[PDB]
C-alpha cells in the first residue's frame, strides 16, 4: 500500500495555455506528487511525477507564495511551479514534500548500505572532446555534438549547470533508446555523453522521400513501440517528447530515439506544439497514453507526408488539436486509418494503448500483424532503407 501524506488544492503553472490552473494534488509516501482536475475518488505510478531527490525553492515571482520542485530526470532538469494563497500554506507543502523525499533517501541508503556486496570499490574530462555543433540550448544547459579526440567517434554531450542539480550503470537495455556512454563533472558543470547515430535525421529522410510506404512506416513504428513499451513497463517512465525531429537512424537503418532535449521554461515552448497531446495542452492528468498520441502523430506524418494538425498560429493549432477530427489522404488504407484514428483519440481513456495493457494493445493491432516483437527487440527485422 502507498499512503497519502498531504493533499489539497494548488495553482499549477501552465506551460502551453491557461498559465495558472487550480488542481487537486496528492503527495504520497512513494514520492509521487500528482495533480488532478478534481478531487479523485479512487494504473502504476510514473516516475515522472516523483519528488525523490528534488530541490525545493520558495519564490515571490511571478506570483507571491510560489514554490518550485526541480528534479533531474535521467539527463533532463525539470521544474514544476506552484502557488498557494498564504506563505503558511506554502511552508506546509514544502515541508511535507521535503519530509517525503528525505524518508526516501533514508530508506534507500539504508537498504543499499545493507546489500552492498564488495561493490565498496572506489573516466573523462572536457579536454578529451572537440566541439563541433550546438544542438540545442535550454534554461539550465546546452547540448552539443562532440568528437571524442582519442577515438574519432561522435557523441552528443549534454552540459548542465551543476548547481541546479546538487548513472552510466543505470543504462536501459533497449537498442532504440539513446544510451549514456560517459557521465562526468567539472568544477561547475555536469556533463552526459550519449550516443549519436550517424544514419541521418528521419525528419530529413522523410522530407526527401515525401512519404514512407505503409510497410516502411510499419517498420519504424514497430521499433518505436518496442522502445516505448520498454520505457513504460521496465522504467515506469513516459517519454512525452516523441516527434519526428527526435528520430534518427543508425548506420544500419534502425531507429534511434534521441535524448537531446532540455527544458526551456525560463529563457517558443518546450514541446514542439504540433506534437502535443490534448491532455498535455490542457494540463489535464496524463499518463502512458501521451506517448501513443505522439506515435499517432509521427506515423500519420510518415504515411501521409504532412501533419494531422497544423497552423502557423499556435492558438489555432491548439484548437485543432483539442477540437477537430482527423482527415486522411484518400490513398491511405483502412488498417493504417484504424491505427491512426485509434492513436489520435482525443480522450486518453479511449486512445489505443491507453488501457491497462498499454503497448500490447498496439502490438496486437492489425496494422502490425505478422511483426515478431522479439525480433524487433533484437534488431532482427531487416531495415527497409540503409543510410549511406
Amino acid at each position: 500500500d502507498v499512503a497519502i501524506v498531504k493533499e489539497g488544492w494548488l495553482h499549477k503553472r501552465g506551460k502551453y495555455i491557461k498559465t495558472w490552473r487550480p488542481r487537486y494534488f496528492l503527495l504520497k509516501n512513494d514520492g509521487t506528487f500528482i495533480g488532478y482536475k478534481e478531487r479523485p475518488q479512487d494504473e502504476a505510478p510514473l516516475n515522472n511525477f516523483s519528488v525523490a531527490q528534488c530541490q525545493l525553492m520558495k519564490t515571490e515571482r511571478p506570483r507571491p507564495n510560489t514554490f518550485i520542485i526541480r528534479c533531474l530526470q535521467w539527463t533532463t532538469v525539470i521544474e514544476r511551479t506552484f502557488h498557494v494563497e498564504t506563505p503558511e500554506e506554502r511552508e506546509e507543502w514544502t515541508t511535507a514534500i521535503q519530509t517525503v523525499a528525505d524518508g526516501l533517501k533514508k530508506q534507500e541508503e539504508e537498504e543499499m548500505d545493507a546489500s552492498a556486496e564488495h561493490t565498496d570499490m572506489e573516466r573523462v574530462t572536457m579536454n578529451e572532446f572537440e566541439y563541433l555543433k550546438l544542438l540545442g540550448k535550454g534554461t539550465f544547459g546546452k547540448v552539443i555534438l562532440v568528437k571524442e579526440k582519442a577515438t574519432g567517434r561522435y557523441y552528443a554531450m549534454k552540459i548542465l549547470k551543476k548547481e541546479v542539480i546538487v548513472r552510466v550503470l543505470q543504462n536501459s537495455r533497449h537498442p532504440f533508446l539513446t544510451a549514456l556512454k560517459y557521465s562526468f563533472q567539472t568544477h561547475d558543470r555536469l556533463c552526459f555523453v550519449m550516443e549519436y547515430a550517424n544514419g541521418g535525421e528521419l525528419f530529413f529522410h522523410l522530407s526527401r522521400e515525401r512519404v514512407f510506404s505503409e510497410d516502411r512506416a510499419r517498420f519504424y513504428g514497430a521499433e518505436i513501440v518496442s522502445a516505448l513499451d520498454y520505457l513504460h513497463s521496465e522504467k515506469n517512465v513516459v517519454y512525452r517528447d516523441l516527434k519526428l525531429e527526435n528520430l534518427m537512424l543508425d548506420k544500419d537503418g534502425h531507429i534511434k530515439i534521441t535524448d537531446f532535449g532540455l527544458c526551456k521554461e525560463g529563457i517558443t515552448f518546450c514541446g514542439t506544439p504540433e506534437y502535443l497531446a490534448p491532455e498535455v495542452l490542457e494540463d489535464n492528468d496524463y499518463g502512458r497514453a501521451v506517448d501513443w498520441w505522439g506515435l499517432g502523430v509521427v506515423m500519420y506524418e510518415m504515411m501521409c507526408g504532412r501533419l494531422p494538425f497544423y497552423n502557423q498560429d499556435h492558438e489555432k493549432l491548439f484548437e485543432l488539436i483539442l477540437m477537430e477530427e482527423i482527415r486522411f489522404p484518400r490513398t491511405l488504407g483502412p488498417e493504417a486509418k484504424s491505427l491512426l484514428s485509434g492513436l489520435l483519440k482525443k480522450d486518453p481513456k479511449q486512445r489505443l494503448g491507453g488501457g491497462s495493457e498499454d503497448a500490447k494493445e498496439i502490438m496486437q493491432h492489425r496494422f502490425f500483424a505478422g511483426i515478431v516483437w522479439q525480433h524487433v527487440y533484437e534488431k532482427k527485422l531487416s531495415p527497409p532503407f540503409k543510410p549511406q
Partner: nanobody
Framework: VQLQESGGGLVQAGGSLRLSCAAS????????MAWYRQAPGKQRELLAS???????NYADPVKGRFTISRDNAKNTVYLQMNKLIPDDTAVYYC??????????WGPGTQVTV
Amino acid sequence: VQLQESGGGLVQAGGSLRLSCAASGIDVRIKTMAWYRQAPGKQRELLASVLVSGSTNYADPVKGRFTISRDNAKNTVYLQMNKLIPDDTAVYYCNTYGRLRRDVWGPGTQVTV
C-alpha cells in the same frame, strides 16, 4: 553521525597493528563495512570488506596478512594488520557504501612502516 579511525602509528616491517573504526551515530550491523588506504602519491584503494552476513573479501596485496572483522556489540569494525611491509605505509580509512559514493570520509589513521 560519523566514522572515526584509530590505532595507527609507526611500526617495523613484519610487525602487526590492529586498526579500529568507532561508528558514532551509524550502525555497523546494518551495513557492508570496508577498509581503505591511500598513499601520498596514489589513489585510494579498497583493502577489505565484511558483509552484514559476516562474509569477508580481500584485495590481493593484503590477502592472508590482514583480517577485517565486525564487532556488532561495540559498533566497530577492525583491521588486524599482520606482517607489515613498507608498501603498506599509508593513511587508512573505514567506510560504508553510502558515505563511499558521496565521498564522505572520517579523519583516517596513519600507518608508517
